Design an enzyme around this catalytic site. Structure first.
Site, PDB file in Angstrom:
ATOM      1  N   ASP A 117      23.050  46.594  -0.562  1.00  0.00           N
ATOM      2  CA  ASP A 117      22.013  45.188  -1.280  1.00  0.00           C
ATOM      3  C   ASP A 117      20.910  45.307  -2.470  1.00  0.00           C
ATOM      4  OD1 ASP A 117      22.092  42.607  -1.642  1.00  0.00           O
ATOM      5  OD2 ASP A 117      22.001  41.807  -0.015  1.00  0.00           O
ATOM      6  N   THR A 118      22.133  45.182  -3.968  1.00  0.00           N
ATOM      7  CA  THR A 118      20.919  45.498  -4.802  1.00  0.00           C
ATOM      8  C   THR A 118      20.050  43.772  -4.950  1.00  0.00           C
ATOM      9  OG1 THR A 118      22.782  44.906  -6.724  1.00  0.00           O
ATOM     10  CG2 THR A 118      22.028  47.346  -5.406  1.00  0.00           C
ATOM     11  N   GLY A 119      20.734  43.243  -4.737  1.00  0.00           N
ATOM     12  CA  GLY A 119      20.192  41.770  -5.090  1.00  0.00           C
ATOM     13  C   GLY A 119      19.295  41.427  -3.389  1.00  0.00           C
TER      14      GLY A 119
HETATM   15  C1  LIG Z   1      27.528  34.588  -3.267  1.00  0.00           C
HETATM   16  S1  LIG Z   1      26.145  34.698  -2.940  1.00  0.00           S
HETATM   17  C2  LIG Z   1      26.567  34.540  -1.441  1.00  0.00           C
HETATM   18  C3  LIG Z   1      26.237  36.157  -0.695  1.00  0.00           C
HETATM   19  N1  LIG Z   1      27.489  36.141   0.879  1.00  0.00           N
HETATM   20  C4  LIG Z   1      28.030  37.246   0.300  1.00  0.00           C
HETATM   21  O1  LIG Z   1      28.179  37.991  -0.620  1.00  0.00           O
HETATM   22  C5  LIG Z   1      28.453  37.521   2.733  1.00  0.00           C
HETATM   23  O2  LIG Z   1      27.971  35.966   3.005  1.00  0.00           O
HETATM   24  C6  LIG Z   1      28.737  36.741   4.119  1.00  0.00           C
HETATM   25  C7  LIG Z   1      29.357  37.849   5.454  1.00  0.00           C
HETATM   26  C8  LIG Z   1      29.414  37.216   5.666  1.00  0.00           C
HETATM   27  C9  LIG Z   1      29.240  36.802   7.259  1.00  0.00           C
HETATM   28  C10 LIG Z   1      28.176  35.591   7.198  1.00  0.00           C
HETATM   29  C11 LIG Z   1      27.934  34.941   7.751  1.00  0.00           C
HETATM   30  N2  LIG Z   1      27.242  33.889   7.150  1.00  0.00           N
HETATM   31  C12 LIG Z   1      26.861  33.739   6.410  1.00  0.00           C
HETATM   32  C13 LIG Z   1      27.395  34.891   4.674  1.00  0.00           C
HETATM   33  C14 LIG Z   1      27.635  35.969   5.762  1.00  0.00           C
HETATM   34  C15 LIG Z   1      25.183  36.424  -0.606  1.00  0.00           C
HETATM   35  O3  LIG Z   1      24.412  35.086  -0.251  1.00  0.00           O
HETATM   36  N3  LIG Z   1      24.466  37.379  -0.290  1.00  0.00           N
HETATM   37  C16 LIG Z   1      23.236  37.862  -0.327  1.00  0.00           C
HETATM   38  C17 LIG Z   1      22.831  38.857   0.328  1.00  0.00           C
HETATM   39  C18 LIG Z   1      23.289  38.410   2.294  1.00  0.00           C
HETATM   40  C19 LIG Z   1      24.836  38.329   2.672  1.00  0.00           C
HETATM   41  C20 LIG Z   1      25.291  38.209   3.642  1.00  0.00           C
HETATM   42  C21 LIG Z   1      24.837  37.701   4.060  1.00  0.00           C
HETATM   43  C22 LIG Z   1      23.566  37.040   3.846  1.00  0.00           C
HETATM   44  C23 LIG Z   1      23.044  37.556   2.652  1.00  0.00           C
HETATM   45  C24 LIG Z   1      23.308  39.053  -1.622  1.00  0.00           C
HETATM   46  O4  LIG Z   1      23.433  39.306  -1.667  1.00  0.00           O
HETATM   47  C25 LIG Z   1      21.043  38.387  -1.392  1.00  0.00           C
HETATM   48  O5  LIG Z   1      20.219  39.786  -1.248  1.00  0.00           O
HETATM   49  N4  LIG Z   1      20.660  37.372  -2.368  1.00  0.00           N
HETATM   50  C26 LIG Z   1      21.194  36.462  -3.257  1.00  0.00           C
HETATM   51  S2  LIG Z   1      19.874  35.086  -3.093  1.00  0.00           S
HETATM   52  C27 LIG Z   1      18.572  36.515  -2.914  1.00  0.00           C
HETATM   53  C28 LIG Z   1      19.408  37.355  -1.659  1.00  0.00           C
HETATM   54  C29 LIG Z   1      18.996  37.554  -0.770  1.00  0.00           C
HETATM   55  O6  LIG Z   1      19.355  36.490   0.002  1.00  0.00           O
HETATM   56  N5  LIG Z   1      17.583  37.923   0.190  1.00  0.00           N
HETATM   57  C30 LIG Z   1      16.837  38.126   0.966  1.00  0.00           C
HETATM   58  C31 LIG Z   1      18.123  38.814   2.089  1.00  0.00           C
HETATM   59  C32 LIG Z   1      17.315  36.642   1.649  1.00  0.00           C
HETATM   60  C33 LIG Z   1      15.472  38.906   1.554  1.00  0.00           C
END
Ligand SMILES: CSC[C@H](NC(=O)COc1cccc2cnccc12)C(=O)N[C@@H](Cc1ccccc1)[C@H](O)C(=O)N1CSC[C@H]1C(=O)NC(C)(C)C
Lengths: 99, 99
Positions: free
Chosen positions: B25-27
């Site tokens: 996760d590059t994000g």
């Molecule tokens: C389109 S925005 C929604 C996105 N979620 C997804 O792509 C996929 O989510 C899921 C996949 C599978 C099961 C899940 C169950 N419960 C919630 C989400 C799920 C997402 O928030 N992705 C984030 C990572 C992630 C994926 C899956 C679960 C939870 C988180 C993102 O890549 C990141 O790093 N972000 C976006 S906001 C800042 C940052 C982040 O969360 N940073 C941390 C992890 C808090 C440091």
């Protein structure tokens, strides 16, 4: 380009004629932008992240440039902490992860 | 490897003697793992993203083997829905985003 990850992978995007900063996010399925005006009808969408689920507005077939690369696809608008360029648009620009 | 982004970039990791699946996760600034035991001292942290914040335990100097590549760094442990390999460890395995 080849983008290393020592810093956040922030790029400039262009959407609605306006330049914005956004993060290239391989952990995001979808692209999520802060509140802005987009054309056309929207559909409801729930997305989930680290803290739970949020409601966002789904706009399809939106023209968007990402780091100079043209894309046309789905943009979600809502209470995201950052503008997120997710895999739906990373695939359009030909991005891969490499190690 | 070259990992395309048509699907979620999930890999197998080894942490604390345990195999898990995790998202490259590059994000993510940080690496976040579902509840497990780790050695050493820890301190609490709040981390935020889509949907708000969660409370985690921060462990330093932890090793994760990520798709066969060993990386040491800080690992956060708490109620994440998905195990996340963030930039702090992606750098160490030499991961870049390319387009
Ligand atoms: C389109 S925005 C929604 C996105 N979620 C997804 O792509 C996929 O989510 C899921 C996949 C599978 C099961 C899940 C169950 N419960 C919630 C989400 C799920 C997402 O928030 N992705 C984030 C990572 C992630 C994926 C899956 C679960 C939870 C988180 C993102 O890549 C990141 O790093 N972000 C976006 S906001 C800042 C940052 C982040 O969360 N940073 C941390 C992890 C808090 C440091």
């Amino acid at each position: 380009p080849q983008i290393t990850l020592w810093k956040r992978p922030l790029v400039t995007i262009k959407i609605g004629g306006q330049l914005k900063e956004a993060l290239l996010d391989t952990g995001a399925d979808d692209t999520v932008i802060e509140e802005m005006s987009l054309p056309g009808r929207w559909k409801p969408k729930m997305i989930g992240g680290i803290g739970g689920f949020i409601k966002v507005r789904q706009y399809d077939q939106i023209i968007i440039e990402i780091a100079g690369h043209k894309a046309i696809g789905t943009v979600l608008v809502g209470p995201t902490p950052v503008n997120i360029i997710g895999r739906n648009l990373l695939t359009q620009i030909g991005a891969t992860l490499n190690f």
